[PDB]
């Protein structure tokens, strides 16, 4: 409630908020106002919001100095670049003048176009069904452990995102694209109701962006169709994805009978070298498992060939199996541990990969018929 919005703020109080709330913006222009940030002044607070219609990011900035309430929207990139370009310590005075938003500091003056705050989209009202609070580092671990396995544009649209699931005292993430799957769970120190929602892939990426890893805790609220995350002075809200996500419990290989264990770095570097001579599009490599040995081979349409032999721990029947080497490298890069375990069955069945020393995360990769 106010027609003459005005505030004055220190530059260093604005810069990180402006960067954060601009996260959802970018890409194809559609509705003009989506390239703008909503500014609202009231009762000691400046709020800044950016949206792409599917998600929204809000920052709150405490206002010390005399301010007058109101709201407008201004071009996000230009406003950020102006503030960032002012000198360290600058005081930034902002005020609406007619249909222009003025930004003043020193003898620098910028008159920006605006679009009406009344036109700025809102996410529909909704009610929270579960709420819990956890360290940022825990949420970062959960997402980093799994996010590479989300689909991008699968027709199975429930795959273009990440399952967040509460069970007992644990929060779990699951991501799969039909060809590989990642699951990770972490205790969060409170008894939770059971709930399973799919966060869109772009919202996963934005939630990750808001975690600086510091000690401001993450508060999560989940509704039937939305998720909200509060960290520090920021509030992120996203729509959820419809559909029945796959049950990871039924995707984990049943009773794999062949157990190989190898050094993570040695395995990763061998796959990385072999990948060089794999087909650029299909990426297939062949694994041959024999007593205490793994052989990896790759070839390409030019008939070039890579071969790597590694000493490993394996007792069991010999077998051969093909994989997309990118999927294997993605898992090994996410494990970052000393020894890996691969659990195999046969050449046409998935394999489970995990840290030999931890069960918090598990990975499943479906083979290729080479």
């Amino acid at each position: 409630p106010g027609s003459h919005m005005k505030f004055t703020v220190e530059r260093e109080h604005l810069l990180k908020p402006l960067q954060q709330v601009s996260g959802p913006l970018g890409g194809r222009p559609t509705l003009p106002i989506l390239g703008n940030l909503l500014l609202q002044v009231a009762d000691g607070t400046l709020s800044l919001t950016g949206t792409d219609l599917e998600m929204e990011m809000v920052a709150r900035v405490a206002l010390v100095q005399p301010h007058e309430p109101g709201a407008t929207t201004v071009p996000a990139r230009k406003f950020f670049d102006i503030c960032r370009g002012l000198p360290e310590g600058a005081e930034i005075a902002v005020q609406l003048e007619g249909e222009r938003m003025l930004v003043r500091s020193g003898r620098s003056r910028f008159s920006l176009s605006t679009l009406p705050a009344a036109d700025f989209p809102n996410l529909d009202d909704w009610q929270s069904e579960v709420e819990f609070t956890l360290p940022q580092a825990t949420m970062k671990r959960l997402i980093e452990a799994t996010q590479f396995s989300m689909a991008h544009q699968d027709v199975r649209y429930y795959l273009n995102g990440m399952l967040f699931e509460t069970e007992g005292e644990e929060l779990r993430t699951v991501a799969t694209d039909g060809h590989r799957l990642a699951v990770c769970s972490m205790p969060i120190g409170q008894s939770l109701p059971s709930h399973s929602v799919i966060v869109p892939r772009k919202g996963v990426i934005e939630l990750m962006r808001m975690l600086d890893g510091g000690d401001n805790p993450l508060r999560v609220q989940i509704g039937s169709n939305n998720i909200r995350a509060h960290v520090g002075d920021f509030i992120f809200t996203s729509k959820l994805v419809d559909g029945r996500f796959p049950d990871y419990r039924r995707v984990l290989p049943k009773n794999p009978d062949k157990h190989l264990e190898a050094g993570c770095d040695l395995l990763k570097q061998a796959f990385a070298r072999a990948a060089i001579l794999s087909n650029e599009k299909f990426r297939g490599v062949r694994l041959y498992v024999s007593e205490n040995q793994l052989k990896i081979t790759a070839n390409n349409p030019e008939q070039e060939e890579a071969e790597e032999i590694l000493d490993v721990t394996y007792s069991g029947a010999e077998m051969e199996i093909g994989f997309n080497v990118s999927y294997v490298l993605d898992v090994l890069n996410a494990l970052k541990c000393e020894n890996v375990r691969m659990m195999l069955t046969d050449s046409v069945s998935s394999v489970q990969i995990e840290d030999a020393a931890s069960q918090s995360a598990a990975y499943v990769v479906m083979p290729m018929r080479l």
């Binding site: 799969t176 799957l181 796959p246 479906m366």
Partner: peptide, 5 residues
């Protein structure tokens, strides 16, 4: 490439 489901 095979699928998990």
């Amino acid at each position: 490439q095979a699928x998990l489901f």
